[PDB]
């Protein structure tokens, strides 16, 4: 197991890119630049019903599997960037968002700075559904 050859005094930070949506959740750990990635675990790898892919239990199951690989490779701390689907769509974090984030703290990893990174338009293209909306 090779990692950054110092971790006893200072931590080694990363970024976690939690994307939580009303159909699914991702947990995705990259390096400090974002360009080189490490393990990425998704809610549908950790359940066998489509309706459960966006559920807090699938979210924490994923956060544990991510934190284990992160601790195993070289990483001891994380920064958090939190995503809803954003522009033209739901703009609110899905149900899995609060559970993955706290299953990182209950798994050994240390937390840094938390941000929301939801894409927001200065004004949009036209939203799906026609002028009477999805009526059912």
């Amino acid at each position: 197991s090779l990692g950054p050859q110092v971790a006893e005094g200072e931590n080694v930070f990363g970024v976690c890119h939690i994307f939580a949506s009303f159909n699914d959740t991702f947990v995705h750990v990259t390096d400090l630049s974002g360009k080189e990635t490490i393990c990425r675990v998704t809610g549908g790898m950790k359940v066998k019903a489509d309706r459960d892919e966006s559920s807090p239990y699938a979210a924490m199951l994923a956060a544990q599997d991510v934190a284990q690989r992160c601790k195993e490779l070289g990483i001891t701390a994380l920064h958090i960037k939190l995503r809803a689907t954003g522009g033209n769509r739901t703009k609110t974090p899905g149900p899995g968002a609060q559970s993955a984030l706290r299953a990182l703290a209950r798994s050994g990893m240390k937390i840094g700075r938390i941000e929301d990174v939801t894409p927001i338009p200065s004004d949009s293209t036209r939203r799906k559904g026609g002028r009477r909306g999805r009526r059912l």
Binding site: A77, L101, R102, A105, G133
Partner: protein, 99 residues
């Protein structure tokens, strides 16, 4: 017959106001008819604050909030119980409900 003096809309001295999309419905409702609500919640939680305020590598780290402006259908807001019915004499009270 005429249920509201203001026709259930805030328009006065205007022809037109720009429509907007009902946030869950995707409907098409005038900006001054839609039901607005500005939510300001903690990003982390109210219960799971201890598990994070303890793991933070910063001693005094204040957790950020999450500001969202929601626009609602009339039907879509009645169905999520954001609003309810009122008496014929109580519909005229326009104060925000006591905190």
């Amino acid at each position: 017959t005429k249920k509201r003096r203001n026709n259930g809309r805030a328009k006065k001295g205007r022809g037109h106001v720009q429509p907007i999309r009902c946030t869950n419905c995707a409907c098409c409702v005038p900006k001054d008819k839609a039901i607005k609500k500005f939510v300001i919640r903690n990003i982390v939680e109210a219960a799971a604050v201890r598990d994070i305020s303890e793991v933070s590598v910063f001693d005094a780290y204040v957790l950020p909030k999450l500001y969202v402006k929601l626009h609602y259908c009339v039907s879509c807001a009645i169905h999520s119980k954001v609003v309810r019915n009122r008496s014929r004499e109580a519909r005229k009270d326009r104060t925000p409900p006591p905190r």
